[PDB]
Ligand binder design. Structure first.
Ligand SMILES: NC(=O)c1ccc[n+]([C@@H]2O[C@H](COP(=O)([O-])OP(=O)(O)OC[C@H]3O[C@@H](n4cnc5c(N)ncnc54)[C@H](OP(=O)(O)O)[C@@H]3O)[C@@H](O)[C@H]2O)c1
Ligand SMILES: O=C(O)c1cc(Cl)cc(Cl)c1O
Length: 322
């Protein structure tokens, strides 16, 4: 309880800062979880596809539960269902594998990672022939019903959506017996998602900003695109407040009640990342940061440098205006 929370429609308190775990590798992730929990983190964001749940599970078993440093009821754990696991028959075995890897009895939030499905099987990136992705045409509404059955089994407290557009979200609500509780999408001053955030508050979904720091060490990247953390306005607010640029980026979000999940393995950065509730931007400063909006998306799935992997798919979420 270093961080403040938001109330989900379920009644669960969701901390406004969580630890991101994308690219924290086995061999380092265990130390990150442990450091983050011990300095006050009560919110971990995970996914099967990140390939580190087995070692995250090792750290959680040591530190969380009856007899341990952290009670289980005070930890918010999120995971996500991968694209190969959209068929109703596969949703439950996928989740139980994640539960086993994590050594958990339940998840607090389970998200649908993408609205489109991949070919069923044990290959996370199944391919053709030409090396393009092999797709499966399971509709996200069918996946959603199968996810609801997990809530009934006590395996998950809340459900939600990742990389869904406003129309996909409303499509899900038209059939939802258990309403999604959270949308997780890319958000920061260059891609402010003001429209989609307003749409979510209308519908009772809370919003989690992924890549809240511009994800500065993503695996390829254009030479010529700006770096969010180097942004002049951000660097000058940093100096004004005696804070780091990352703290500026995160304060902007929690100030509008957007949940953030910054990833770090650096103990000093982990510490500072959750220390965003002791200062406040003036309306005019907020405005400066609201002026940076440029529709710059950093996280787009790519493959085979011999391209944008899914951009051409009919269910690709990023083609609508929001
Ligand atoms: N739903 C989805 O499809 C999806 C997609 C993308 C991301 N996510 C989630 O959101 C999380 C966060 O996003 P992200 O990992 O893409 O990137 P991010 O959190 O925006 O950026 C992390 C990068 O910034 C560095 N960093 C951390 N704190 C810093 C600080 N205080 N000052 C300067 N640099 C700092 C990290 O380095 P060090 O670690 O070395 O310290 C790392 O290179 C992910 O880990 C994942 O859990 C989900
Ligand atoms: O969105 C992600 O975090 C992500 C992570 C990994 Cl490791 C692979 C793909 Cl396609 C992703 O989309």
């Amino acid at each position: 309880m270093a961080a403040s929370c938001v109330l989900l429609h379920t009644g669960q308190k969701m901390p406004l800062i969580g630890l991101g775990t994308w690219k924290s590798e086995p061999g380092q992730v265990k130390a990150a979880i442990k450091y983050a929990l011990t300095v006050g983190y009560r919110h971990i964001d995970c996914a099967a596809i990140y390939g580190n749940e087995l070692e995250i599970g090792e750290a959680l078993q040591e530190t969380v539960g009856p007899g341990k440093a952290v009670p289980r009821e005070e930890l918010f754990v999120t995971s996500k269902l991968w694209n190969t696991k959209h068929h109703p028959e596969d949703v439950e075995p996928a989740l139980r594998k994640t539960l086993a890897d994590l050594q958990l009895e339940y998840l607090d939030l389970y998200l649908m990672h993408w609205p489109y499905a991949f070919e069923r099987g044990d290959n996370p990136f199944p391919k053709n022939a030409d090396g393009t992705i092999r797709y499966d045409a399971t509709h996200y509404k069918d996946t959603w019903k199968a996810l609801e059955a997990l809530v009934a089994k006590g395996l998950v407290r809340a459900l939600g959506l990742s990389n869904f557009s406003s129309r996909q979200i409303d499509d899900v609500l038209s059939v939802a017996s258990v309403r999604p509780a959270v949308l997780q999408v890319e958000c920061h001053p260059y891609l402010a998602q003001n429209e989609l955030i307003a749409h979510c508050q209308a519908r009772g979904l809370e919003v989690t900003a992924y890549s809240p720091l511009g994800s500065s060490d993503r695996a390829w990247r254009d030479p010529n695109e700006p770096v969010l953390l180097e942004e002049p306005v951000v660097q000058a607010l940093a100096e004004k407040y005696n804070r780091s640029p990352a703290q500026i980026l995160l304060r902007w979000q929690v100030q509008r009640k957007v949940i953030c999940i910054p990833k770090s393995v650096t103990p000093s950065r982990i510490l500072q990342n959750i220390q965003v509730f002791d200062f406040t931007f003036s309306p005019e400063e907020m405005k400066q940061l609201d002026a940076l909006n440029k529709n710059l998306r950093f996280i787009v799935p790519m493959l085979t440098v011999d391209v944008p992997r899914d951009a051409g798919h009919p269910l690709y979420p990023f083609n609508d205006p929001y």
